[model samples]
Target: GTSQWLRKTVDSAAVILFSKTTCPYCKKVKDVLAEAKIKHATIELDQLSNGSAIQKCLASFSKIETVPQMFVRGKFIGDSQTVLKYYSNDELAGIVNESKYDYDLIVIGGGSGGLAAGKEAAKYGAKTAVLDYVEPTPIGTTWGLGGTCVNVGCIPKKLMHQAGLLSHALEDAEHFGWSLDRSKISHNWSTMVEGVQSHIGSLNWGYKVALRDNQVTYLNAKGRLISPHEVQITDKNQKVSTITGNKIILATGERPKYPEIPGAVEYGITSDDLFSLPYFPGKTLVIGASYVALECAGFLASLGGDVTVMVRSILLRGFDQQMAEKVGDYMENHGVKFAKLCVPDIKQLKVVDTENNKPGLLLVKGHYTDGKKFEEEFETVIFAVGREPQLSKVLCETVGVKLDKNGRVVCTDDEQTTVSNVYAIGDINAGKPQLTPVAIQAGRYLARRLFAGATELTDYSNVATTVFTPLEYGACGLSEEDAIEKYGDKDIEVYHSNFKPLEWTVAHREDNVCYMKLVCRKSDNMRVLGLHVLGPNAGEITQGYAVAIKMGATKADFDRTIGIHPTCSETFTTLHVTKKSGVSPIV
Candidate 1:
């Protein structure tokens, strides 16, 4: 089936890619392969007419669905997800390389975790190669050698959100004896967005330069495993090339899922898109009640948007329900309209338009209430529903890797997959929260498995996460709900402190509220089951408690750990509950 031109292109030691141009995932695959300096022969399915023969040939061999399929030495590799699988497993090193000398490690994604793995692997005399598609790294957030946290997701959003706090502070500066015009006080959302973009660009460029400096082999194209020991790279122009390595690491993260709501396509925005929006919406309607959605609502509400958040549930899932309720209450108090269990019909919203000054809504049915009454037109609708893993075709099908039911690649307790020497990390891997630190830690643990010769793995228990709301929300170990369900004991003591932050005493702002709760089993031992906090610097403060919890610290332990004095973090230890007292109030 190969044409003269196709044979000529494949004559060299190059990578081979089968893809469609329109799909972003396919593009990423091509990009990483090119960046890695692997020439590729990409067969664009979109260009072919009546390509049933090609499809049939692929279907006969590969396990997964349509286009962006890949091959190495005529062996079937999977799509983007499969490609990532190979990188994580370290099989991509062998698959991509044609040389007699095998590479020590193959790193996929070229993101923070991947780069760290590459750098660390190469340190031990492992030949390393990094593949990415998003200009420098597949994630185009911060341009530095670091990945998502620095580039686009956490760092930039936090910086801008912090600025929003500053704006709110400036607006309330009148109470602090500063005579500033409230009308003149405004945040330049456009300018801030541009600043984040430009700064991230600089960082991305810097990362590429750093890779060169560190002697980490860099690929600007998409990468997919051609075989268990071979990988193929594809460029933007659809050319293919190949490389090989013995081991691989997948560090490709995730992206915001833009669900196919009726208006979603028309709106032309996602969580990522909303982040890069040039202008802030005057009246934003946020869909989904996740932490990100709530935080975004908080930021916009502070910016004076008549923000309304529609949550499909009574309480936020995947977190401490009470703490989440408190946050929701805080948002509601701060002028964010909270709509509970309201599932909107997309078709109904489509009929109405806020084209002019006055908002319009189309009558639609609501699950609990009459949805027709609440179809108010919003300037924008932001969805922080969730994210999906960015997988590649060239890697998976080539070696017959299968993703788990949740669409994530499965990894062993040691970060290896069902197939030996293959591994997955980050969002692509199951059984861990999709946090930056978790990915890094997983990669590090995987590195331990790869290079350190350690049989032990990372303990995933007691991971910590923070919500970027004004009040920091922290969680370590199990919540009271989880404890009750797991322990099946109703005698779990829940101690909570809801009051003004210590700093609030001087500031005299009644708006600041601190929420801290410690749940423990009642056996005199008072084994700490959960510790959740929502206040200032929750992320920073929770880490110490997380470490303590991991050591199986009890209520007695809390009494013994010395308070840092007047600090919010120390409040966990110095809890004075007038209602009941087994724990020390303060030491």
Candidate 2:
């Protein structure tokens, strides 16, 4: 009865864990607790409930949140991982016998940053616990526990986009005079997701194994600041528990937001839904032209979606507007429909009913530039409009976290918020540009600050971002508009070139125009103020230009960087405006 009865009594016991045999992290915690000779019971989720109950368990843990909530001797202890940290620091194990609460580091969100932080804290022999509503870790590189980037945000999205691009390109083989059957170009969304899922799953498992290897305790569920140093976890079940740590870190990412408009939510979906869908939609209306909205529209359009891009203006308003406008124009010619400069009030639009049960999209009409209004219909609507930080009300009030105007958490120079020992990164801190690479770098920098005792602050000034449309777009330095705005119009010289790419040597394709602008203070004799490029490989090609810009190259200096013959890059060096009146030997 003690063995079988103990397991059943856990939800009814001082400590109970509903876990799976495959959940290595959960196992690690169990083993750790067992080593400490702590009495606990676990119900293998697969054994106790059907598949539906697993999802039900996930939803049931509203209060404790996340997972692996635990109790001890009739008092709530925390998740197994948190308990491990407590035991390691002679806190939980020490307290288990003595009964007290204490810890050195408390990390929120079991994502990369928080886990790394918690591990680092433990390396210093500090008591640490990571409390997060963690997802199942990847079983291999195919499935991972690393959170958004590994699971849904970056890796999967990139692969999905690549697959989508491949599908669309092959479908358009007829345009290139290649004979191919549509069946031959087909793709399986579930296959890719499952493959990625498995890969990520393995990696997730490996991370937990590594954590055990490293002696860092982690909780697979959410925790709240009951106080500055304390937290509580409920679990995948409705079981309740708590813990306390010295310092806390916030690394929760952002989620897509639907703008307020009549019927916006009814007809439109965000990036979250777009990525989660099991199959492809034929027609899609992407609303709110940001990098996300536009990129999704572009990627889907290329994949044969009846793609329509609705923008208030060219996307990337903060970046090179001119380039975005050009890119927007270019995408339209490549099968992307543009509802440029319009805002459709969600209220004003009506969803078109398709008899076939295809998803429909409706947008409240509005102008792109002036942000006016409109009413429109399409197959499906996606908002690339923007995202806001996903901060819980409990944590927000508990840590006194500061948020930006956009409801993003406000952090300090070292990526730490005003609250002592608490740090934040990614889209949550809106001052810097939001992108996956940016977040990764930010996370790495934050880790270095703690792990290697890094003294250097993060440098985002020259951080280049790439926009993947037909022609890649990358910008590291300032755009002409930004340069002009930051510096006055005085003595600023701009040199740019328009040329047909070499690959299109004989084709009737559009000039394949490359725009390169070097902005400099006129007083300084055209010292490089900023360099902007738009064309093929712009993202890949701009790194060197970024270095040159940082090194203070001038227009004349760019002129001197000797041309790389028969190459597009050479265009930057030999840049000269062609004119009807001007005669040149080169012409």
Candidate 3:
């Protein structure tokens, strides 16, 4: 077949160029390869009798319709611009640079970053492979290929979050003239769980298919760094294998950490288990103040479960304190209780088998600084204390990858660890935002830098993130406290407003709940330093403004740009009251 013929043609040359005889761009490309003192083969498809079929084969094999396809090492190197771009940077040499390794790149952890980097590298003619494995949760909960976001992370998390909202919406339906049966308004938790898991299966399968289409090897094996250029693979059956690559990417993302307290592992669960739990999670107690902690608490509360959050110190410690307080306050008013005992130092938490030899019961015992004894019971307890990168599992210590004190791999601004050929991306990289999108952008850009000879770097500053608590909090750039500290109170002006969402107005609940804040610097045209929204669709509103803030949007720029009427987002355009004014920003 012509496809096999195309493969043979590509394999025959160390560097092969597919060109049309009369194409001037192809003519220039021909001379440039020769001028670079490279001996290569050129096939003038336009002059061949089997011209059309051959071009079709190039289109099918390379997945590109354009002419002048250059394949070095039996891998597609794109067209004129890519070829010149590579040659201009003298990167074309590396495109043909031979190595003894089994693969040009081996991306570990088949999560978003791993799949992204591997696929992108293959486009730029780097033989790539992705090894992904989801180690079973402590309670035996396991998922397929897509990382935490698709499995135990964002996808299931958001679906449950949405489920919680629907429950709220059903109640709100009462005020909006909907016939209701409050008695029959119960939810089937397992149905939602089953549906969510099914959707994730499709996503997992889609990622595998995408990898196949892109010509990148996909392995369902756990990858460990045996050496800088090699990774030892452990399969599901405990079968051992070793794969070597010229370059390696550590995308082994973080997993939820279990506390060292007694009965913690045997009885407790994390977000990893919450979404996939077969039975109902009744009357849950969540530990920690991370967004994961709050989100789980909020959703469980809305889903008609008794949810209590145990705060050790602050709620969302790294976030804007004022906003964090507001989120906590909102959760408090909406039935999510906080069990904060700073007055007491907790010794241990124990799970008790109190009723009928069944699970979902617990006991917490703690004592004050100068005292002893306080015991509380709960049905279910979940740990959202924090997450730690999978450092030792991949054997970073054995391979000389520098790590920060937090067990995170230390990397430069360009995502390179101590080992030059080994790079780190996603949640594993120290000091980088642990969000999925940030990892993806860094992963793709890193691939470009290596395989495409592109010089663009991932900008880590001003990255936007959202907390999916009942009232979502979207935030970007610096927090108000950070801004005030940096620029001084006198030099900082905070523009803020608390508005009622129009939909909320119809079903009217909290009048001054939904809000916006633009922290600005007084010196630089009142340039916006922080963008925050504590409202519905906060992610949607913050996303557009994130770009604006990154481009140095001033408070006036937001004011100048007309906003969508009757929107929670429009609150930004009309934020006239400053915190300095001492006048309330209620509307």
Candidate 4:
């Protein structure tokens, strides 16, 4: 769209006069800045053929339709009458004069949100700077550029999960006419890490190259807020530099949290370190039952480690419990151990231990939710209790940027902070989904609002996500409990079925192991309120269903549609059982 062109033009000039030749006022602002000996840009296009489209773009941002539209430093000032009034009051001096900011926008955190915003703002012709630095975890794990998804959260996490899936494929091949030597089918941890890290390093360099090509200043330093417009950037080295921006976006991603018990930080590792573990993590203990926890445990187990997940309560706190339980069961059947109803706090380092990059056996100790205690030992301990946005260090609160109790940034629906010039996104935004894709979308949307003069906001609802556990869980919309809570139990109908994947049928895997649940409102012609799936390629299945749900597709719509044969997703179209009927949903 010409919106980008519109943004570039709007931001490039200190003052923008979208003038039309026919209007007497059109040439007024156009020549006013000239008389004042000021730098200005004017759009006198209508004699403007495609002026109508550009008109909509301008109106979106300025909230005005007719021309003689005026802007100062990219902020909408007014139309003709308003400008005349400002000039009469001599209040127009600030509009035409004042330049102190080093950059139009300085984005802290080179991860998903900041990267997108920095690049987009620059694309819109706003002078932008992106400051990003990879700090270290307790295990000394540090990643290169492109932020968490490229380095740790999604890229490495999925690659490792894929590694497990491949291994499972190898096992499934045993029944598919391929003779396998079980002993030869072992995974080498070092080789996997080498491959994964190498790809990540390329992306690291890729981001820098992209930034340089885009003309966004890429500073390899951590940025901390010194004021609303000024930031102090510090590299790994002792040297520091100060930078300024009229608008600042805080996309500093969240770090994994450790339990309050002693030796947690000293002895515990996290997803941040799991990929780089020098040793094989031979008898690993994963504490907490987050999607991160389960995914890590599943991969480690499949990769030939003795993996045990320690859970304090239910698995995957915010996800649907039934789906979570099914995933847990599949992992249990797949050989991952579960230590239910317990927490681990005290992790004592044992002996002279650092195997390969080394691991002293951790004597991990904690009790159940009750006072009763339990003890375990492991070569590695990775804690995945949750993550917290450490905003205090950024001095986020210093400028009245509000934060919720969980340390997440509290902002408006459009992702702006309490301070008008500051903003937050990604996992740090309170009550927002902490998925990478959500962050990326929000980042681009924010940039559009700021620089492109677009008013569209990111839609946070109906965001589909997958937990890459042993049995993947891809979900969208409300859960059964959530639907019940929102639409009352009697007003919601739950349609579900447990079906065997076609490939798994040949492999002789358990029947009814993979599951699907569709929750719809009883009143709205049984319109879909939720979609959940637990099976192979669950993410792919849920992704397609999410589109239909987003389009307001109903259960009847699913029934009327035809599904591809011999596929896991085909089951959705044919599902006829309701939970209320007490009928078996097994397919």
Best by TM-score: 4
lDDT of 3: 0.82
Model 2 stretches astray by more than 4 angstroms: 1-103, 112-128, 134-144, 164-213, 346-377, 390-399, 499-501, 506-508, 523-527, 547-567, 576-587
lDDT of 2 by residue, 206-264 (tens): 76886676566766766666666567777778688877654566776665677776666
* Candidate 4 similarity to native, TM-score: 0.86
What lDDT does the true structure give each of the candidates? 0.67, 0.61, 0.82, 0.82
Taking all chains together, each candidate's TM-score versus the true structure is 0.75, 0.69, 0.83, 0.86
lDDT tens readout by residue for model 1, 71-185: 6533566688888787678777567654453565677787757766676554433456888775332123223345566665787778767766776577567666788887876
Give the range where candidate 3 is weakest over 10 consecutive residues by summed lDDT: 342-351
Model 1 scores a C-alpha lDDT of: 0.67
Question: Weakest 10 consecutive residues, lDDT, candidate 1?
Answer: 5-14
lDDT of 2: 0.61
User: Which digits, one per residue and each the tens of the lDDT, describe model 3 over residues 1-587?
Assistant: 66665665564334567889889989888787878765455677878787788888777668886678887665788788888998999897776767577887899888878878888777655778899888888767788888989888888899999999998789889889999965588987878889998999999889989988887788899888988888999887999989898778999898888777776777778998888777777777788899999999999998888887877678998899999999999999999988775221222244434454334566655443335455667667788988988578887576788888998888999898899888999998988888999989999998876654345799999999999999999999999999989989999999898988888867868898788888999989999999888999889888988888789999779878888887888878878998989999887
What C-alpha RMSD separates each model from the true structure? 15.4, 14.9, 9.0, 6.5
In candidate 3, stretches whose alpha carbon ends up further than 4 angstroms from where it belongs are 1-99, 342-359, 367-373, 396-398
